[PDB]
Amino acid sequence: FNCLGMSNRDFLEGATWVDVVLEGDSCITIMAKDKPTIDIKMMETEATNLAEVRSYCYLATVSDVSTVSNCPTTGEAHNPKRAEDTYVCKSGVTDRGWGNGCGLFGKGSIDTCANFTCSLKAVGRMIQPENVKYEVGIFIHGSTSSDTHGNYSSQLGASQAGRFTITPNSPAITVKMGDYGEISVECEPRNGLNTEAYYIMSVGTKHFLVHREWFNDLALPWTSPASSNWRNREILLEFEEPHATKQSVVALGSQEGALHQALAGAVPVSFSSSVKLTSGHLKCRVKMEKLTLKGTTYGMCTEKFSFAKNPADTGHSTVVLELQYTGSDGPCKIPISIVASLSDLTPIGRMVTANPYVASSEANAKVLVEMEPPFGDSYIVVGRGDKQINHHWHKAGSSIGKAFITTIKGAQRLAALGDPAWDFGSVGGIFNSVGKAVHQVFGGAFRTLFGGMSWITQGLMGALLLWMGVNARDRSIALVMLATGGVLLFLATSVH
Amino acid sequence: FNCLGMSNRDFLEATWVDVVLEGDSCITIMAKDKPTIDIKMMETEATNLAEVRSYCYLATVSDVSTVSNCPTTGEAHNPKRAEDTYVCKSGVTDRGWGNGCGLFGKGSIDTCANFTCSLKAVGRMIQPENVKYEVGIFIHGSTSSDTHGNYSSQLGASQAGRFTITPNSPAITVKMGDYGEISVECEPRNGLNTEAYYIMSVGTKHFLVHREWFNDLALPWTSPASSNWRNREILLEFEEPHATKQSVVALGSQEGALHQALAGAVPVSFSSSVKLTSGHLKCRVKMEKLTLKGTTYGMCTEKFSFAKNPADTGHSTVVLELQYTGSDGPCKIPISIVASLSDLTPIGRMVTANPYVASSEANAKVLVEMEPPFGDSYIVVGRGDKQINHHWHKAGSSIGKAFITTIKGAQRLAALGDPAWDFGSVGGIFNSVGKAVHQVFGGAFRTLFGGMSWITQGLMGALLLWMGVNARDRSIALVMLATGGVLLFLATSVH
Amino acid sequence: FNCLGMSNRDFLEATWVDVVLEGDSCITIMAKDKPTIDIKMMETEATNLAEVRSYCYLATVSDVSTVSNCPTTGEAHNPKRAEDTYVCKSGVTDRGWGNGCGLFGKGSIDTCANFTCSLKAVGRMIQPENVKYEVGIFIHGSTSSDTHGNYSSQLGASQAGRFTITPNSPAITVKMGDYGEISVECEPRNGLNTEAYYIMSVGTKHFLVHREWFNDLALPWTSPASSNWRNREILLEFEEPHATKQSVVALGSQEGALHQALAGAVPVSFSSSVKLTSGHLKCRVKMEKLTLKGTTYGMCTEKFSFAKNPADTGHSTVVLELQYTGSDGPCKIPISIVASLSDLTPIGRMVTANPYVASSEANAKVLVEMEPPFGDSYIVVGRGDKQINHHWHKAGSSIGKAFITTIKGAQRLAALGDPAWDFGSVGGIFNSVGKAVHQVFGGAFRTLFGGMSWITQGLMGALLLWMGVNARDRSIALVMLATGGVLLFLATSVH
Amino acid sequence: SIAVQTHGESMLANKKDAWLDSTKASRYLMKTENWIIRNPGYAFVAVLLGWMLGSNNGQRVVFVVLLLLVAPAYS
Amino acid sequence: SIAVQTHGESMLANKKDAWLDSTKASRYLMKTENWIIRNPGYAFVAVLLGWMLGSNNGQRVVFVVLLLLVAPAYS
Amino acid sequence: SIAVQTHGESMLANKKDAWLDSTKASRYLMKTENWIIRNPGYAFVAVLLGWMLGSNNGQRVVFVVLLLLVAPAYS
């Protein structure tokens, strides 16, 4: 629900609503002017009523083996066990003569049948769209300590957080956040997990989210959901060198390890009577027109503060600290700011804790304050006069470097989500409305031509496209190949 | 020891002959004035096998532990890292004020899990001096059809010999009664390339695998009687660092994957000694002390009857089993193949050198094999009014015979390599220059196209034909066409 | 805390001034209507150190075992290779019937020796929030000679302040009695780049060392509190094998070689916390609340004498000590520097601004120090019969002094880099844009020649000068000449 | 992965069938043709590309086949 | 077999690691590098065949690379 | 640690002498001494190759110094 000690979160400036794409294990903080800063995150997604679509055998067993033999030129041997369904049969041919049995020399046909039993099977199930169940957490910053910022048994008890379920039946929900008002969100669970290009494959106790084509293409003996007879059983059987009267059959060993190797790249889920996975995305739209500030008329705290917990970098060019307040007065605003220097005390930074305050009247209160300073040397100032306490902070980056980082984050977000990435922080407008519509056609033209391809193959194909485009003429086909080769290399390096 | 009823049978024609006993093949030798010979390698046995390496294809994880660390301490160290049977990995998780750290970022974790191996695939190696070949030798004397394959009786007739060829006994001469002596000298060391093979055991299945393939195999492995495994993380998955406890899961049994990797290996038996019915063995067969009987019994005069009617053997030879009714001692059998019942001159070749009733008992059965010519002939048994005439048609022609023997020669060159020039060889100069050229060409060919499977051989050969046709130098074109033809032959021949 | 007798002193000149408090230097501020200010960084400290890595430089080998395998019977696997405190190596040795083997060739051996670290060098990291700079500030009031340097008197006179500057308290104001308030506001994060250093404790010696050099050391090492060493085979030597027992010897103490590798590392003191005396600190000092002393007393009436003759501080300032015979309470001293005794116009600016006698007791010694102009001058105390004079010659010239100032500024620019532009800075557009253009070409040059040494720098500077003076293009022949000049400057800087 | 690395044709002379000879033709081609059937667009783009960087009909088909074989391998 | 027909990267938008992400770089190239290392002679013939097919240097090196790639994969 | 891994000049603003600053001149050039002294013939041959690898008279000096510095550093 809350994203402070989380590696990857995005920041979104505000005007009455904004649509976001809650990703797997990331979070979003939405800063707006004259609004409480709020964080929203998709904690997990779930399936509940899964129906079997297939089974695959990976440990088969041969029970009894028979060989019907015919003399040379007598025709083809026919084992009567070909009329029974649980028997796998194959026709071979063995040398026959006077020493073997028969009155003619040459290649006599034999028919060998072995009883097929399946010991262990991998079960592939599917998800109906009306059963996906997203868990979503929303939290208002408010006035928290460090031992309650992520508890949610205190955030819920202070009307500052909520976990709620998004279902295709009920794509929208409102949360009462106390004096902050109401926060609403309507999502797109149907446009969430594709749920029509995936199966849930269970191998023993390991459950995976596999593609439908891949699951359909396994070279293993398979069967219908309720059925018992198998097809393509000969994959797990070996008929050795033929013998006139007794040719043996061996079942191959368990393919569970080979299946696990094949599952490389699948997404492990945790099927415990209900599929639970913490990946994918969910596109939502949050309304905060009913979200208001709390305690607009507290006033400033008078007595001195302290750094109860030193300022710490959070990794997103943001700082967090915790102030202990000696004042025994009631709720009051915290006089805290980021300045370029302790002379010329004007604020230069923006604070994401949204007008902090000391929510209690009991003394020795502890308040977590979390703010984003600018690049270079800054001072965190709280208090005034003799009570003013200060802290020197330094931010290492630069604006152009941050622009490059944001550019590559956006490029790989387009890679991750494709078209829904154009709905990340959008406020409408023709620019996004046409960017989505052109990314759709370009993605189709790119996916019919380079889908189902690994990073090495696409990297080499892109390198060849660069070579060709440099040697290309007419300057019109050149740039197309340059763009495609750039994209293929970006994709090939985006995962290493 | 004799080959009647084998689909792989060869025929050979100053006093010794160089043969290559193959795995399931047989050799028939018909000399100028000698009895017909059947020689065959039957079984190869290796007796003392030394373990080299054991691969684990099934592992289990017992006890998983994790130690977390803050970004202010560096990497973590799990105490169980100092225990032999534990596999440990260093992962990285997210840390902040919520977990209990002082700073935000990435903290280090170290996770150790127990590693017990359940099933190991043992590999063993062959010592050349422990290699035994089993060789069967037989002389076409006087046998019935059921006796023709019985060693307990051919030994009593002094018409057969089963002997073991080893490096310490490379040459054996076997008594053959009234036919004389037949000898062989063989080089077992050149037979089975023990320096390039292993005996992998996967449960109750044993194979003969290349050493280079066995060594490169990617599984946890241990030395003989060591019980300390290496590269165990191949059968392990460390997943989803959790900053409290990370789950580690062993992968499934690799036995099915192992059998899929073994696709191409030669299965063998293993009952404290590896048995093998493939491979070859070069021998030199000495007939100088071998001869025909030297006396003739005199024609059998009673009536003959076919106990088993003439049957084709599939090798352009016709076999039948006569039954002699009379009991007038050993006697010579009147039997021949003629062009017509007017000119009774024999025309074919007699595989049974001089058929005769060995015993002096009524209803004695005798198996006779002939080599009739292509076309129409007659099997004539007896003379006068006891004569039996059996019309026999041998389909085919000598041109087709030559073509099929050329194909067999090419296949022997492919499967046997250089010893193919030692087959039916009598030390000719042509064989020596051909063999010497074959080493220098099949070294260069093999060092380049040695690891190629049939499909890539076919593609490479087709490309070479194309390039040689488009080649202009007229000498790079010749050699490129030659190599491309070899590649197409090796690709198509095994299908 | 005090600045006289320093040999590294700087002089500066509308309400604040930006200074860099170099570790072994001092700054004297001489404003218009303000007392003279002595500001210096005395020592940097670090209290909480966390280990990151321990390098072994003295190991011990105790129990050596060698197992051997025949030339083609597998690879030897020592049982103790299961144990973790053992370093194991596999070698090859000559083997034959002379040796226990049955085959002649290269047999295999596995040797394992127990490893034990005796002495380790521990690397700790400094958290930036535990860094504190100790800063001394001093007002040039009335001091004697024995007191000008005694802190327990200047504090007793409300005349000096010695304070701690941390990231949690980057600014502070010092009470200075009748002089008002001096305030300072610093940047305790840019001073010591704790992100690029480690404290290595080898023996009882402690060093401030670079991170990359520490991480490139070739020695056995552990993570903190781990004792699971790695690269243990650096400290061990395996002699020639013997197939039954091999010798393993630990190389001697690497303490000496470690000291040699530390050439250039900065020695520190780490008894219970790290105390550095080098470094730099960037502070703005503001004087708006600093007032000239409110004085109600007049000139001294009795005689003065040189209690200590004028002396030359190495920075073109004189210092002397006067003796007051009178006992008329506090009184201001009529001391001046003039060009000639017939015209007593004061011309040398005073550094001990408004000198005076403090106590009412006679025989008071008063230290007065001054900045006379170049050439000849006279120090005059009193008037008439009570007048005392002292001739003083200041050798040098302003035109020459500009050269020394420029070279000292260049040395500061080399030593400080970018913060050198904040030295003596008061706002400014040229100064800020110079700092900005020094950001670029400061790291642009660094990424090309940061890791070089002085001799490498000099050879590169000479080669760039050669190519530039030959270069046809005037655009490229100026940048290359500039790099050649700066590289030779940085080479000669160490001398 | 062990199953991917396969013991090929044994150098031992053998007038019989090896361990898995029923799959000798399939095992080297099944995944390639399967991937092609799932990715027709790559087949078309590879055919188009082999014409670009060739120099005659002889060596354009070679490029086309080389691309059509190199992509199903290495996925 | 089924190990060669690997699943590949998941279309799902993920930021954890997939099932066997520790082999995302290895498994594709392990067989090829082993085959090249253990058949070093084929490198020469591929080099010469590419240098003879290619009209120009770039075409030559492209031929060589695809030749060095398609042989260890189908063998 | 291996003494060729020399810490070198520190980037810290310092005014004392660092560890073993009496040897700054020696430790970076002492090894080239006691090697040129023991191998004058190499100096002769290096001058000879410098005079023949340099088209320009201003290239010969650079080559000669480069050789006379690079050989002793790697023994």
Ligand SMILES: CCCCCCCCCCCCCCCCCC(=O)O[C@@H](COC(=O)CCCCCCCCCCCCCCC)COP(=O)(O)OCC[N+](C)(C)C
């Ligand atoms: C004289 C005028 C010249 C005008 C030149 C204009 C050139 C502009 C071309 C810019 C194109 C850059 C687009 C790059 C975006 C890459 C996004 C990405 O990550 O890749 C996408 C797809 O990327 C694309 O296909 C982007 C479009 C292709 C490039 C378009 C080139 C158009 C060239 C126009 C030339 C005009 C010339 C006019 C001359 C007069 C991934 O696939 P998704 O569909 O998102 O699905 C995600 C799932 N999976 C990871 C499994 C793939």
Ligand SMILES: CCCCCCCCCCCCCCCCCC(=O)O[C@@H](COC(=O)CCCCCCCCCCCCCCC)COP(=O)(O)OCC[N+](C)(C)C
């Ligand atoms: C007259 C005009 C002048 C021009 C004359 C040109 C002469 C050209 C002659 C070319 C001869 C090429 C010979 C190639 C021999 C390759 C043999 C080889 O690869 O050996 C294989 C066996 O391969 C063969 O049997 C291939 C035989 C190919 C023979 C090709 C002969 C081509 C003759 C060309 C005639 C030139 C006509 C001249 C007129 C213009 C055995 O391998 P081993 O390593 O010993 O054992 C392992 C066995 N195995 C690989 C099968 C797993």
Ligand SMILES: CCCCCCCCCCCCCCCCCC(=O)O[C@@H](COC(=O)CCCCCCCCCCCCCCC)COP(=O)(O)OCC[N+](C)(C)C
């Ligand atoms: C024609 C138009 C007019 C152009 C006017 C150009 C004026 C440029 C004047 C540049 C003077 C630079 C003097 C630098 C003195 C500083 C001391 C020094 O040389 O040492 C520097 C040398 O390093 C530098 O190169 C940075 C100094 C600034 C260099 C700025 C050069 C600008 C040249 C501009 C060229 C003008 C082109 C005009 C085109 C028409 C060390 O600094 P760092 O690298 O930060 O320290 C770390 C290294 N160490 C541990 C050893 C201390």
Ligand SMILES: CCCCCCCCCCCCCCCCCC(=O)N[C@@H](COP(=O)(O)OCC[N+](C)(C)C)[C@H](C)O
């Ligand atoms: C006659 C003259 C003709 C002129 C022709 C003009 C042609 C111009 C073509 C330029 C195309 C460039 C496209 C790529 C730009 C970088 C975008 C990026 O990847 N960066 C995005 C990522 O943002 P997010 O990931 O936060 O949100 C995601 C939502 N979003 C993607 C909608 C913003 C932004 C800047 O940070």
Ligand SMILES: CCCCCCCCCCCCCCCCCC(=O)N[C@@H](COP(=O)(O)OCC[N+](C)(C)C)[C@H](C)O
């Ligand atoms: C104007 C220019 C004129 C140009 C003239 C052109 C002439 C071309 C003639 C080429 C004929 C080559 C035929 C070679 C076939 C080889 C296959 C083979 O080995 N077969 C052998 C018999 O096979 P074996 O089973 O006994 O094997 C063992 C035989 N060995 C020991 C001899 C190897 C014979 C040759 O078929």
Ligand SMILES: CCCCCCCCCCCCCCCCCC(=O)N[C@@H](COP(=O)(O)OCC[N+](C)(C)C)[C@H](C)O
């Ligand atoms: C045909 C027309 C031809 C005309 C061409 C004329 C060209 C002559 C111009 C020469 C100007 C050179 C001045 C710059 C070099 C000296 C740099 C230096 O380091 N020196 C500084 C001493 O500063 P500090 O370190 O004391 O204080 C700190 C102050 N700081 C951080 C700003 C340096 C000053 C400037 O000297």
Ligand SMILES: *[C@@H]1O[C@H](CO)[C@@H](O)[C@H](O)[C@H]1NC(C)=O
């Ligand atoms: C054959 O297998 C079936 C299950 O597949 C089993 O029920 C039956 O008992 C088996 N029959 C024999 C003869 O083993």
Ligand SMILES: *[C@@H]1O[C@H](CO)[C@@H](O)[C@H](O)[C@H]1NC(C)=O
């Ligand atoms: C939250 O705080 C309550 C006390 O109000 C405590 O009982 C609970 O364990 C805390 N939960 C977490 C996750 O810290």
Ligand SMILES: *[C@@H]1O[C@H](CO)[C@@H](O)[C@H](O)[C@H]1NC(C)=O
């Ligand atoms: C071989 O002949 C013996 C002796 O007559 C007979 O007892 C036995 O049954 C035969 N054995 C075989 C192999 O058929």
Ligand SMILES: *[C@@H]1O[C@H](CO)[C@@H](O)[C@H](O)[C@H]1NC(C)=O
């Ligand atoms: C081996 O060394 C370890 C420490 O590394 C020590 O504790 C142990 O006593 C030694 N083993 C022997 C020789 O018993």
Ligand SMILES: *[C@@H]1O[C@H](CO)[C@@H](O)[C@H](O)[C@H]1NC(C)=O
């Ligand atoms: C400083 O002066 C005090 C007077 O209280 C004296 O006792 C002490 O000896 C002096 N200290 C030093 C360091 O000289």
